[PDB]
Each structure stands twice: as C-alpha cells, then as structure tokens.
Design a protein around this ligand. Sequence first.
Ligand SMILES: *[C@@H]1O[C@H](CO)[C@@H](O[C@@H]2O[C@H](CO)[C@@H](O)[C@H](O)[C@H]2NC(C)=O)[C@H](O)[C@H]1NC(C)=O
Ligand SMILES: *[C@@H]1O[C@H](CO)[C@@H](O[C@@H]2O[C@H](CO)[C@@H](O)[C@H](O)[C@H]2NC(C)=O)[C@H](O)[C@H]1NC(C)=O
Ligand SMILES: *[C@@H]1O[C@H](CO)[C@@H](O[C@@H]2O[C@H](CO)[C@@H](O)[C@H](O)[C@H]2NC(C)=O)[C@H](O)[C@H]1NC(C)=O
Ligand SMILES: *[C@@H]1O[C@H](CO)[C@@H](O[C@@H]2O[C@H](CO)[C@@H](O)[C@H](O)[C@H]2NC(C)=O)[C@H](O)[C@H]1NC(C)=O
Ligand SMILES: CC(C)CCC[C@@H](C)[C@H]1CC[C@H]2[C@@H]3CC=C4C[C@@H](O)CC[C@]4(C)[C@H]3CC[C@]12C
Ligand SMILES: CC(C)CCC[C@@H](C)[C@H]1CC[C@H]2[C@@H]3CC=C4C[C@@H](O)CC[C@]4(C)[C@H]3CC[C@]12C
Ligand SMILES: CC(C)CCC[C@@H](C)[C@H]1CC[C@H]2[C@@H]3CC=C4C[C@@H](O)CC[C@]4(C)[C@H]3CC[C@]12C
Ligand SMILES: CC(C)CCC[C@@H](C)[C@H]1CC[C@H]2[C@@H]3CC=C4C[C@@H](O)CC[C@]4(C)[C@H]3CC[C@]12C
Ligand SMILES: CC(C)CCC[C@@H](C)[C@H]1CC[C@H]2[C@@H]3CC=C4C[C@@H](O)CC[C@]4(C)[C@H]3CC[C@]12C
Ligand SMILES: CC(C)CCC[C@@H](C)[C@H]1CC[C@H]2[C@@H]3CC=C4C[C@@H](O)CC[C@]4(C)[C@H]3CC[C@]12C
Ligand SMILES: CC(C)CCC[C@@H](C)[C@H]1CC[C@H]2[C@@H]3CC=C4C[C@@H](O)CC[C@]4(C)[C@H]3CC[C@]12C
Ligand SMILES: CC(C)CCC[C@@H](C)[C@H]1CC[C@H]2[C@@H]3CC=C4C[C@@H](O)CC[C@]4(C)[C@H]3CC[C@]12C
Ligand SMILES: *[C@@H]1O[C@H](CO)[C@@H](O)[C@H](O)[C@H]1NC(C)=O
Ligand SMILES: *[C@@H]1O[C@H](CO)[C@@H](O)[C@H](O)[C@H]1NC(C)=O
Ligand SMILES: *[C@@H]1O[C@H](CO)[C@@H](O)[C@H](O)[C@H]1NC(C)=O
Ligand SMILES: *[C@@H]1O[C@H](CO)[C@@H](O)[C@H](O)[C@H]1NC(C)=O
Ligand SMILES: [Zn+2]
Ligand SMILES: [Zn+2]
Lengths: 636, 636
Amino acid sequence: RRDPFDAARGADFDHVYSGVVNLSTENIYSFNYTSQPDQVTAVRVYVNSSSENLNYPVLVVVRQQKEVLSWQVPLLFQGLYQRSYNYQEVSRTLCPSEATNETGPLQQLIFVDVASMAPLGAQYKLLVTKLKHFQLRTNVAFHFTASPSQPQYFLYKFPKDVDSVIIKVVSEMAYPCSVVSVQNIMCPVYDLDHNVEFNGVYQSMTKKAAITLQKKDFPGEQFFVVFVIKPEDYACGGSFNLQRKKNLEVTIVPSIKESVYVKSSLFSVFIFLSFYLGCLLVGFVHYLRFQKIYFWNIITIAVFYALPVIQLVITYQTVVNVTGNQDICYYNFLCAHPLGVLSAFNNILSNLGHVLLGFLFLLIVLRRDILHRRALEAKDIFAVEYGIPKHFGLFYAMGIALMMEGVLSACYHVCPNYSNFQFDTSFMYMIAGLCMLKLYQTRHPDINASAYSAYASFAVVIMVTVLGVVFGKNDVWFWVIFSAIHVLASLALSTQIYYMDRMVLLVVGNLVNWSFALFGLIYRPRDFASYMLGIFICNLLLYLAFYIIMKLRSSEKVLPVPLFCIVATAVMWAAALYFFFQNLSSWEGTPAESREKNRECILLDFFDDHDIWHFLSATALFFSFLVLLTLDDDLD
Amino acid sequence: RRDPFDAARGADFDHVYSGVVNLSTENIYSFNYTSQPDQVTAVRVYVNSSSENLNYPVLVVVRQQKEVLSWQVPLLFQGLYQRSYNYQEVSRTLCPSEATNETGPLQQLIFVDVASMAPLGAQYKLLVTKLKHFQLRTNVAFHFTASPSQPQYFLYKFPKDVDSVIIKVVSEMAYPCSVVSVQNIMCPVYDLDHNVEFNGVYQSMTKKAAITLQKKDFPGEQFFVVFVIKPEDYACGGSFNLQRKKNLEVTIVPSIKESVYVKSSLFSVFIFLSFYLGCLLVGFVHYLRFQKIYFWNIITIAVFYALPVIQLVITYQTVVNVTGNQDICYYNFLCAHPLGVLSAFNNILSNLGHVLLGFLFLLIVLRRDILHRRALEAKDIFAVEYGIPKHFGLFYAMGIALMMEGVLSACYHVCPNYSNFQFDTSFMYMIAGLCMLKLYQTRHPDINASAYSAYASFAVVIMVTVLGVVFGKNDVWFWVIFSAIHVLASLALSTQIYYMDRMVLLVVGNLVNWSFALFGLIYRPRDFASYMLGIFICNLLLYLAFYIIMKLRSSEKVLPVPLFCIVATAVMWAAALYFFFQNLSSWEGTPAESREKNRECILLDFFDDHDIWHFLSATALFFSFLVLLTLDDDLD
Ligand SMILES: *[C@@H]1O[C@H](CO)[C@@H](O[C@@H]2O[C@H](CO)[C@@H](O)[C@H](O)[C@H]2NC(C)=O)[C@H](O)[C@H]1NC(C)=O
Ligand SMILES: *[C@@H]1O[C@H](CO)[C@@H](O[C@@H]2O[C@H](CO)[C@@H](O)[C@H](O)[C@H]2NC(C)=O)[C@H](O)[C@H]1NC(C)=O
Ligand SMILES: *[C@@H]1O[C@H](CO)[C@@H](O[C@@H]2O[C@H](CO)[C@@H](O)[C@H](O)[C@H]2NC(C)=O)[C@H](O)[C@H]1NC(C)=O
Ligand SMILES: *[C@@H]1O[C@H](CO)[C@@H](O[C@@H]2O[C@H](CO)[C@@H](O)[C@H](O)[C@H]2NC(C)=O)[C@H](O)[C@H]1NC(C)=O
Ligand SMILES: CC(C)CCC[C@@H](C)[C@H]1CC[C@H]2[C@@H]3CC=C4C[C@@H](O)CC[C@]4(C)[C@H]3CC[C@]12C
Ligand SMILES: CC(C)CCC[C@@H](C)[C@H]1CC[C@H]2[C@@H]3CC=C4C[C@@H](O)CC[C@]4(C)[C@H]3CC[C@]12C
Ligand SMILES: CC(C)CCC[C@@H](C)[C@H]1CC[C@H]2[C@@H]3CC=C4C[C@@H](O)CC[C@]4(C)[C@H]3CC[C@]12C
Ligand SMILES: CC(C)CCC[C@@H](C)[C@H]1CC[C@H]2[C@@H]3CC=C4C[C@@H](O)CC[C@]4(C)[C@H]3CC[C@]12C
Ligand SMILES: CC(C)CCC[C@@H](C)[C@H]1CC[C@H]2[C@@H]3CC=C4C[C@@H](O)CC[C@]4(C)[C@H]3CC[C@]12C
Ligand SMILES: CC(C)CCC[C@@H](C)[C@H]1CC[C@H]2[C@@H]3CC=C4C[C@@H](O)CC[C@]4(C)[C@H]3CC[C@]12C
Ligand SMILES: CC(C)CCC[C@@H](C)[C@H]1CC[C@H]2[C@@H]3CC=C4C[C@@H](O)CC[C@]4(C)[C@H]3CC[C@]12C
Ligand SMILES: CC(C)CCC[C@@H](C)[C@H]1CC[C@H]2[C@@H]3CC=C4C[C@@H](O)CC[C@]4(C)[C@H]3CC[C@]12C
Ligand SMILES: *[C@@H]1O[C@H](CO)[C@@H](O)[C@H](O)[C@H]1NC(C)=O
Ligand SMILES: *[C@@H]1O[C@H](CO)[C@@H](O)[C@H](O)[C@H]1NC(C)=O
Ligand SMILES: *[C@@H]1O[C@H](CO)[C@@H](O)[C@H](O)[C@H]1NC(C)=O
Ligand SMILES: *[C@@H]1O[C@H](CO)[C@@H](O)[C@H](O)[C@H]1NC(C)=O
Ligand SMILES: [Zn+2]
Ligand SMILES: [Zn+2]
C-alpha cells in the first residue's frame, strides 16, 4: 500500500519547489507546523505551471485533517458567446482553525499532491507560504491584489465595545468587476466564482463598496471577508500571459452611536417648528397692533398612488432584509443609517419639512379665508371697486399636494429602484400646474376649466415621461416627436396667453428653442422625469417673473412682505437647485456603476446631499406659495 | 517519487471493495474502460464509511484526464438555528465525454484515491458502476431516487424535428425540498447544494415541476437535467442512519405546434364576434318588422391604475426572461404557452371578451339612447304618464369599466406576483357598485349622490382589503373589527332601502349573519380580495332578486326578452362561479407550494380553468348589464 511518510518530501514553506510529472509519476509534500493560542495561522498555496499544455493539465490536491481541496493549474474559464480563457497561475488560502487556551497548542500536518497524465511530462512550480497579514484591525487601512484565479479573504474580530461596523472597499481602475462577501467562521469558505453568492451578504463592485454589519448576527463576534474577481465584465458594465490583476484597499470603521440619532431627530423637529413659532409671533404682533371637488379628487388620487407603491416597497424591503442580497435597492450605502427593520432611516426622516410646512400653509390659508368670509358677512364695498374675487380651494389643494409629495418621497426613498423612478417628484408637477392655474386665474377672469384640465395634463405628462424612459432610451424618432410637440405646445400657450409687452412671447419662445437646441446637441439626459421637473420649474419661474414685471409696469407699489418673500424664495430656490444637481446613485445603469458615485455624508454625521435637497425644496415651495398668496395685498 | 501504476490496484466495476486506512496508508485504484462512437458512458462512484468518526473523516479523490473531484465520506451539513447533520454514504457521477466517429474509440483511465488521517484506522467501502440508464427518450417516463448527499443527473438529446420540449417532474411525498436544473453539455456540472443555481434555468419543487425549453438556445441540441435534494425544508415550506431519500419520476414531451395558436386565436375571435352577428341579425329582423363626469373620471383612473402596474410588470417580465430564475412569477407552468417574449400567451389572449362585450354593450346603449333622444325630439306624451326618466351616463360608465377591467386583468396576468393580487378583479368592484347604484336610482327618484360616493366606497374597500391581506394574515382583532363594520353597514343599508315585503330586510340581515358565522368558524380564507368579490356578487344578485320579485308582486307581465336575459345571466353566473372556485397556483405561500397545484389544460390544447373563468365572467357581466337595461321595457 502507499506510504505517505515514506514517499513524502519533508518540506518547508517559502521554498519554490519545481518538478516535472509524467503519467506514472506523482509528487507529494508533507508540510508541518504548529499553532499557538491567541494567534491565527492561514497557509496559502501558489501553483504555476510554466508550460501552456491544455490537453493534459496538472492536477493539485491538498489534504488536511478534515478537509480536501483540488483543482487544475491551467484553470479554464468559459464565457458567453463561446469564449475561452486560460490562467496559468493559481492560488488558494486554506481554512484556518482557532486554538484556545483550553485546547493548548495544536500540531498540524498538510499534504500536497501534484499529478498529471501527459505522456511526455508537465512542469510545475509550487510555493507554500504562511500569512502574517491575515487579521484586520479597526480603522487601519489595508492594500492587496486579486485575480480571477486567485481569490482572497481575511479575518476580522469584533472589539469589546463596538456594536456595529462598516466595511469600505476602494479601487482605482474599474476594468474587471468584483464581488465582496461577508461570511461566518465555519469551514469551508466559498471563495469561488460559482458559489460565492450562496451564503452571507455580498455586493458586486467595480470601484466602491460599503457593507454595514451588526454584532448580534454573528456568533463569536468574528467574520471572514472574501474578495473574488470575475472573468468577464458583462454583469457590472460593458464587454469583457493572461491576467486581470485588480488592486483593492479595505477599511473597517465603527458605526455611529444613538446619540447621533437623538441629535438629528431633535434638530430636524426644531428647525421646522421655528417657522410655526415665528408665525405665532407675527400673529401676536398683528393682534397687538389691532388692539370643493379637490377634496375627494386629492383623496382618491392619494389612495390610488399610495396603496400600490406602498405594498411594492414593503415587499422589496422584506425581500432585501431576508435574502441578504444588497443589489436590489439603489441606496447610497456610504451614508445609510438603519433603524429597526428600516435600512435608510435618514433618507426618510429628512422628509419632515414637506409635511410641516404644508400643514402651516394650510392653517394660515384656512384662517385667512375664514377671516375674509366673516368680513364679507359683515359686508364691505371697499372690496368691490377696490377689490377682486377671492378663491380658497386652490391653496388648500396646493398644501395637500405638498403633504402628498412628502409622503410619496418617503415611500419611494424606503427603497429606490428602477420601477419607482417617479413618485419621487411626481406631485411637484401638480404643484407647478396649480401655481400656473392660480396665476392665470388671478389676472384674467375666472373662466375656470373645471378641475380636470390639469388632471388630463398630468396624465398625458406622466404618459410621455414613462414612454420615453421605458422606450426612448436609445431612439430619436420619439425624441423628435416630443420636441415638436413641446414647441407646438409652447407656441399655443404663448398665443393663448397673449390674447409694451409684445416681446415677452418672443422671449419665451426663444428660451424654449434654446433649450431645444441644448438637449438636441447633448441628446443624452437619460432622465426624462428630471427634465420634466426642470422644465416645469423654468416655466413657473418665467411666468412669475413676467407677472411681477407687468405689475411693476402698471405703476403700483409692492408691499414689503411680498418683496421679502420673493427674495427668500429666490435664494432658497438657488440653494435647492444646487443641492439637486449633485448626483448620488442612480437607478439607470447596473448596480455596480450606481454605487460608483457615493459620498460620505455632510452637515452632521447623519445627512447628505439628497436630504438637504429635500429640505431646500420644501422651504422654496413654501415661500413660493406664500409669495403667490400675498403678492396682491396692495390691490385692496 | 510516487508511482501510481506501481501501487495501483487494477480493479473492475461493480465489485464492492473494502479497506481500512491509517495515517501512513492510502489506497489507490486504477479503473479503465473504453468508449465507442454513438454511445454515452457515465461512471458513478459510491463510497460508504461504516464508522461514524467525525474528527477523522475519510477523504476521496477521483482523478481523470482533465478533471479532479474530491470530498469526504461523512458529509457534514450546517443548517439554520445551529443545526448539524452527518451523512455516511456519498455518491457522484463523473462528467461524460462524447466519442465522435472522427475521434474513434477512446480509452479512458480513472484513478480513485482513498486516504484518511485517523491515528488508529478508518474503514471504507467503495463501489464503481457504469450507467446504462443515462440518456433520456421523449415521451418515455423514468423513475429514480436522490438524497442530499447523492445528487443525480441525466442527458437528453434533441430529436430531429422537435423544436420545443417540456420537462415534467413528479413526486409523491413532498417532505424534503428539491431543485431541478437544466444545463448545457460543458463540464464541469454543478450538481452541489451551493452551486446548482449558478448556471442554467432552475426550479425549486416539492411535488411538481415543469420547465419549457426551446432549441436555438442550446448548441448541440443536448442538455443535462440535474436533480439536487436539500438538507432542510425551510425554503420550500415548514421546518426541517440519517437519510432523506426522495423518489422522483421525470418525463419529456414535445411542445405544441403553431397550428394550435392559429386555431385558438380564430376560435377566440369568432366565438365573441358571434354576439355582434346575432345582434345585427336581430336588428335586421326588427327593421323588417317595422317595414359627462364619468368620461374624464374613468380616463384618469385608466392611467393612474395602468402606468405603475404596467411598468412594474414590464420590469418583472424582462428580469425573469434575462436571469432565467423561474421562481418570481406565480404562473401555472403546466399550461403556459409563450409567444415571442411573452411567457404566458394564453392567459392574456383569453381576455378578448372583457373588451369585446364591453364595446358591444357601449354601442347598443349609445344606439338606444340616440333613438330615445330622437323620439323625444319628435315628442311623445306616452312616455310621461306611462314612462319613466331616462339616463345614459351609468351604462357608459359600466361599459368603460368592463373594457378597462379586461386590460387590468391582462396586465396582471403578464406576471402574477404577491404585489399584484389586485388588478385581477378590482374593477368589477366598481362594476357591482355601479349596478347597485343604477338599481337604486331606477326605482326611487333620481336623488343622484353625484359620483364620488362610490368613489370613496371603492377607495375605502381597496384600502381595507390591502390592509387585511398585508397585516391581517394571522391577526383576529382586525377581523373582528371588519365583521362588526360589515354588520353595521348591512344594517344601515337595509334600513335605508326599507324607507308584504317587511321580511326581506330580515332575510338579508340573516344571510349576512350566516356569512359572518361561516367565515368566523372557517376563519381561514386568506384571500381578502376573493371574499370581497364574493360578497359584492352576493349582494348584487340579492338586490336584483328582491327587485325582480317586488316587480312581480306589482302585477305586471315581464317582456320575454328580460326573462331570457335573466335566465342566461343566472346560468352563466353559476358556470363562472364553478370555474372560479377551481384553484391553480396562488401568490400566497412559497413558490414550491404554489406550483404544487397545477393542471394540464382543458378544452382545446391551449386554455385551462382560469381562461374559462375569464370568459364566463365577461359573459355573465354582459348579460347582467343587458338585463338591467332592458328590465323595464314593459313600463312604456
Ligand atoms: C516519467 O518521468 C520521467 C521524467 O523524469 C521520465 O521517465 C524517466 O526516464 C529515465 C530515462 O529512461 C529513467 O532513468 C527514469 O527512471 C524514468 N523515471 C520515471 C518516473 O519513469 C518520463 O518523462 C516519464 N515516463 C515515461 C514512460 O515517459
Ligand atoms: C508563476 O508566474 C508568476 C508570474 O508569471 C511568477 O511570479 C513572479 O514572482 C516573482 C517573485 O518576486 C516576481 O519577482 C515576479 O515579478 C513574478 N512574475 C511576474 C511576471 O511579475 C511565479 O513565481 C511563477 N511561479 C509560481 C510558483 O508562482
Ligand atoms: C497503519 O495501518 C495498520 C492497520 O492495517 C496499522 O499499522 C500496521 O501495524 C502492523 C503491526 O505492527 C504492521 O505489521 C503493519 O505493517 C502496519 N501497517 C502500516 C501501514 O503501518 C496501523 O493502524 C497504522 N499505523 C499506525 C502507526 O498506527
Ligand atoms: C453503505 O450503506 C448503505 C445503506 O446503509 C448500503 O446500501 C445497501 O445496499 C444493499 C445492496 O443492494 C441493499 O440491499 C441494502 O438495503 C442497502 N442498505 C440499506 C440500509 O438499505 C451500502 O452497501 C453501504 N456501502 C456502500 C459502499 O454503499
Ligand atoms: C402614515 C404615513 C405618514 C407613513 C409614512 C411612512 C411609511 C410609508 C413607513 C413608516 C413605517 C414603515 C414600516 C415600518 C416597519 C416595517 C416592517 C418591515 O418588515 C417591512 C416594512 C415596514 C412595514 C415599513 C414600511 C414603510 C412604513 C409603513
Ligand atoms: C414624514 C415622516 C417620514 C415623518 C416620520 C413619521 C413616521 C414615518 C415615523 C415616526 C416614528 C417612526 C417609528 C419609530 C420606531 C420604530 C420601531 C422600529 O423597530 C421600526 C421602525 C419604527 C416603527 C419607526 C418607523 C417610522 C416612524 C413611524
Ligand atoms: C437638472 C436637469 C433635470 C435639467 C433641468 C435644469 C433646470 C432645473 C434649470 C436649467 C435652466 C434653469 C432656468 C434658467 C433661467 C431662469 C430664468 C430666471 O429668471 C428664473 C429661473 C430660470 C427659469 C431657471 C430655472 C431652473 C432651470 C430651468
Ligand atoms: C438664474 C437663476 C435661476 C439662478 C439661481 C440658481 C443657481 C444657484 C443655480 C443655477 C445653475 C446652478 C449650477 C449648475 C452647475 C454647476 C456646476 C457644478 O460643478 C457645481 C454646481 C453648479 C455651479 C450649480 C450651482 C447652482 C446654480 C448656480
Ligand atoms: C393597448 C392595450 C390593449 C395593451 C394591453 C396589453 C399590454 C399590457 C401588453 C401589450 C404588448 C405587451 C408588451 C409586448 C412585448 C414586451 C417585450 C418584453 O421584453 C417586455 C414586455 C413587453 C414590453 C410587453 C408588456 C405588456 C404589453 C405592453
Ligand atoms: C387582453 C386584451 C386586451 C389583448 C388584446 C390585444 C392583442 C391583439 C395584443 C395584446 C398583446 C399583444 C402581443 C404582445 C407581444 C407580442 C410579441 C411580438 O413578438 C409579436 C406580437 C405580439 C404577439 C403582440 C400581438 C398583439 C397582442 C396579442
Ligand atoms: C369564493 C370565495 C371568495 C368565497 C365567496 C363565495 C361567494 C362567491 C358565494 C358564497 C355564497 C353565494 C351566494 C349564496 C346565495 C345566493 C342567493 C341566490 O339567489 C343567488 C346567488 C347567491 C347570491 C350566491 C352567490 C355566490 C356566493 C356569494
Ligand atoms: C346560479 C346562482 C344562484 C349561483 C348558485 C351557486 C352555484 C352555481 C355554486 C355555489 C357553490 C358551488 C360549488 C362549490 C364547490 C364545488 C366543489 C368543486 O370540486 C366542484 C364545483 C362545486 C360543486 C361548486 C359548483 C357550483 C356551485 C354549486
Ligand atoms: C512538526 O514535527 C513533526 C514532523 O511531522 C510533527 O509530528 C509535529 O507535530 C510538528 N511540530 C511542530 C512544532 O511543528
Ligand atoms: C488565554 O490566556 C491569555 C493570557 O494572557 C489571555 O489574555 C486570554 O484572554 C486567554 N483566552 C481565553 C479564551 O481564556
Ligand atoms: C484497458 O487496458 C489498459 C490497462 O490500463 C489501458 O491502458 C487501456 O487503455 C484500456 N483498454 C480498454 C479497451 O479498456
Ligand atoms: C457515425 O457513423 C454511424 C454509422 O451508422 C452513423 O449512424 C452516425 O450518424 C455517424 N456519426 C457521425 C457524427 O458521423
Ligand atoms: Zn429625494
Ligand atoms: Zn384571472
């Protein structure tokens, strides 16, 4: 019978053994070592077959006390479109075993067998090395390299006090894709292409990756971090001595404490309660100085828009929480602090203003309308020859739209995805349309188009946006049709509004044509909803400026409060647009590329760009509504 | 150096070798064989270690010309909640290599090494057998068994003419879950627990599985079918000499031809064009004898309900087509014939009636209303003393609701899922509500409650159903609250309708109470939408029956046409309810259990139960609308 000790070559690590194997010859080595308590040893085996022989690959088998590994040196990879790749260098890290004080020192023996079947012979070069840079320490960086045939992984241990950690992986050249996974300390370790996704959380990456881990999940307070490169780049982007070495740096940082949550919640509440306090102060000062269809329409639309998206997001959040695959939601993982089951608590809590300011506007408008109704009940002719008709439902509709926009934004931000690209700024379309309607009605007679003209406009706009996003991704005929429709609509609106100021119509038409040429030359926004939002904002601001300049030309003085509100609205809009143009993650494109643009939070240790955008949008919209309400105070 | 031939034991298949291995001993066998053209050989290796030693398992390594396999005899499995399982028998099928005429007969050698590290010794029993039942033949069944540590797989070759095939797998006892996968002929073959989902389509199963394959996808017109059992049953259902042997039967059947598509399309078109032909003939015979809000409301609801679900189903269909994981959509895979990119063509084409019948009803109502308007223009006092007020909006609303319910059902059936349980019968809620409103208005004065009463009713009903399904799955407090609200609503409706027939209110209340007791004792419908549909249908039929009986008690003769329409409506309702009660697949429950209840098509070779349900529902609704329209013809 075969005797390993008899034919084994008592060998030592770090010596590059070389050999040649025939059909009737096999080589075996008998490495030995010892492990001591409080230390972790991880052996690594490198095998390079100098020859390129492919019909008779060299077969390598590593035997330990309780595990067996095996592979070939000329590793062969098969890729789509019938492509073949051959790698002539292979490496593997053996699963380590801990040694406790009770167990004491442990002696370990490892056998390595190299054998082939070539009739003439195949060369091989074998190296076995120990690992000193195996463990990882919190806050200390680390650099290394990986290859499609040389997967890597390391060990981390939970400190005494840390209850949550973040793993950040950074690279420079994103040519070959990669996968980063976290697993428990239970051999075997799945560090292969076809089994790395079986267990533990994982993330595909090309230039950036971030994973947040708690403590209660892992027994023993330790885990393995595995990095695996991929033969082809189809999954994470474009198309595909062969080698694809990729350099990586890995950092582990403790997570924030609950004190940050308390601070952020208190700040968010109080910053917006200050507005109510100021309104109460102003009302007190004024008192001292003195000393329909929209309802059910909005209710139905809100329920219709809420139930489906709400259930869809519930299901997506549950699935992402259960399966552990962090490639479904398009979060901004660098700053996403979870609470309870929620995965991104900040992005939802940052929507408090959209509700609070809407509530304040509703309260103020209701009080003003009730006061005007009481005054009319008392009757006064000063509001007839020196007054204009008053309407109330429009402002309530605007405020309810603001509330619904806030709730929709929160629901969408629960888990962003390509199927929820709308519901993020959808209701601001309605807000802009309502402001347009209010401006149109205030100057000209009522001539109300009931309420369904705006409904049809919104339905058509959503139709066109969805059609363009889902189909107009790469086509231009639809783009030409949309441009023609937009130009025709602009001309028709200009003609209708027209019937000293004969050049404003030409100015608006020329601005629209300039935008037409701009995106025709650029011809690649790829975000139809964003451009629709921008165009609505542009038209609203243009109409507001035209109306204000016309009022100025009419030789009347504007009350100071409308002027202050105008300036505040302008500044807030500027800031909000600045924070909006910043891009963090995007539903379009593969998840690996979406995370390629992430940032590590601004302001406090909680918020980031998008939260500031939410805040500034809420404030700017509130000030615009107040300006619209109060602009015509001097007329009475 | 090590010499394989020197220590190799020239062995033969089917002989159960036995041995004992120590630290310094390792046994090797050197099996040999030859492969001839037009035949496929697949060796299989069984290894059983009699001892239960966990600390010192036996290591087995199989070496071939181009592949190496390795494993341990006492296989260890880790399961959730810190559970461990050990299997003492292992088996494996080597990847076969085809032998072509040009290549000629091919000699093959296979080395098997058994080695351990026990200080005393470990026993082992090894068997190597050839496979004669490896290939699969079309339409011929096959029985076999599998175990968590003994995965199986077989080969299939595409016949000359078959362009599409179906693989059906059947079992009897669904205790241990299983996975069935299809892969190409390219070694290695992933038949392990942690890598079986990497490549090729796959399906989790417990009692039934079905997979449809085309021909152009596979080069060589051949493929491997792999069956893998699972250590635990958490994924596919409940909780978890150890063994879990599972018996399976596999059949392969050629798919249908395009002639079936042509036949089914022509039949579906003509069966429903027959209604228009009959209406035209009736109009011809009659001629020979003679010889606003709803619009915009429904149009807005159309987009508001279509765009989210339409885009969402687009995304699901694209993803399921791309990845190849057949566990997202809850189809009925036994009868799902795809066309182009669509995966279930029949379930969509079976919705032609919901549109055609609605269009016919709209046309007939428009013609009748226009004729009545012309007659009124001519003026006739007969329709005053012996006439009743005429209305038209409700009938148009009903027709549009039907025409939109058809499209909603089609969109939902594009890819059924737990996030789309509505949109299958939602619009018929509004249909029943409108029928009730029309019945209320026809007898009592107009007293139109505008149109938003039913709007709020529908919104509240949908909200309640969604809340119950998402949350009231295992709770009873919500169920008690819902029952109390239903009883209160029934009492209020009876009181309002009341103000010879003093017992009808008691009868309706008692029927509602009987339903209360029924679903309280059963207390497990777990389909809130289904029971909402049932209750709405029951109330509609109940009110219609009481109205008709009251009219009968009024001592007037009913025109034969309304009687015929009533009888046809009753018969169609009975048939539709019968076809509805049949259950094929269900979004609730794991996908493995959902496919556990599937059926192999009825009627032609295309349709099944659900399509017949669609047809019968459309016909019954159309006849009910016609009955409502024509019920009071005798009055004039
Ligand atoms: C086996 O490998 C060796 C390569 O070193 C070759 O065979 C050797 O041939 C020489 C010359 O006759 C002998 O002195 C050695 O004893 C042989 N060794 C062995 C292990 O066979 C050859 O490449 C291989 N064997 C054959 C038959 O080609
Ligand atoms: C197999 O090939 C690789 C690369 O072809 C060899 O790696 C070399 O390692 C030395 C050691 O410092 C470096 O100086 C060389 O630069 C490396 N090669 C290259 C191309 O950079 C490796 O030694 C070969 N053999 C084994 C067993 O790995
Ligand atoms: C090796 O296996 C054998 C069991 O078959 C044991 O060692 C044998 O011991 C007898 C008695 O001294 C010798 O005659 C044999 O030559 C030995 N065989 C071998 C392969 O060493 C024992 O179980 C194992 N070896 C040890 C050291 O325990
Ligand atoms: C390992 O154990 C299994 C079962 O424990 C053995 O399988 C037996 O095979 C014979 C051959 O027909 C059957 O008659 C027995 O019924 C099987 N066992 C049982 C429990 O049913 C097997 O022979 C053992 N060894 C190997 C190498 O498989
Ligand atoms: C009433 C309005 C203001 C609420 C707006 C925020 C809503 C959308 C938020 C607040 C609380 C959230 C829920 C809190 C907890 C969980 C449990 C988790 O396993 C699934 C998601 C689910 C069910 C969340 C879904 C989104 C949610 C309902
Ligand atoms: C405009 C909105 C976002 C403002 C915040 C209001 C709502 C959404 C907030 C207020 C209090 C919050 C809850 C506070 C505590 C918990 C318990 C935790 O285990 C799950 C999340 C859950 C249930 C939170 C979900 C979101 C929540 C309901
Ligand atoms: C950001 C992507 C979606 C493209 C859209 C950009 C939008 C937000 C930008 C681009 C051009 C901008 C406009 C340029 C000029 C003016 C005139 C000024 O008196 C009021 C603001 C207004 C009308 C701007 C509003 C914001 C605007 C419309
Ligand atoms: C004409 C009126 C409406 C302008 C008021 C809005 C202002 C604040 C907006 C309009 C265009 C915006 C800029 C558009 C593009 C860039 C380049 C980017 O790398 C930094 C931000 C920056 C510089 C933006 C900052 C905010 C910005 C200047
Ligand atoms: C106009 C009305 C009657 C149509 C109602 C059925 C709708 C939902 C059907 C008709 C055509 C269908 C499309 C036909 C082809 C494909 C390509 C596939 O890769 C994604 C789905 C997609 C895009 C289908 C989605 C569903 C679809 C849009
Ligand atoms: C349910 C009701 C509304 C459907 C009635 C409209 C019919 C005619 C529509 C609905 C879906 C459509 C199909 C959608 C997708 C494809 C795949 C394409 O490669 C050929 C055309 C084909 C096969 C379409 C033909 C027309 C079609 C069958
Ligand atoms: C099938 C699941 C969702 C449970 C609901 C079952 C429904 C559809 C069943 C159960 C009880 C049935 C009702 C029982 C009695 C009557 C009175 C009769 O004069 C007309 C039929 C009618 C009105 C039935 C209609 C169908 C019905 C409502
Ligand atoms: C005509 C109107 C009043 C409807 C009357 C109710 C009739 C049509 C319905 C109500 C309950 C139904 C039954 C409920 C359950 C089953 C068991 C199933 O394995 C076969 C069909 C069968 C036997 C159904 C046949 C149709 C049925 C009898
Ligand atoms: C190495 O020495 C012998 C040789 O195999 C081995 O039995 C022993 O366990 C090892 N001890 C150490 C300290 O490496
Ligand atoms: C083992 O002993 C060392 C001695 O310093 C101590 O630091 C360590 O915590 C001990 N470990 C265990 C598991 O007892
Ligand atoms: C079996 O016989 C020898 C023994 O190793 C082997 O070389 C040869 O290829 C095999 N031939 C056949 C016909 O099986
Ligand atoms: C090989 O020869 C046999 C002889 O009957 C023939 O049937 C078969 O088609 C041939 N196959 C190839 C690939 O030439
Ligand atoms: Zn946002
Ligand atoms: Zn259906």
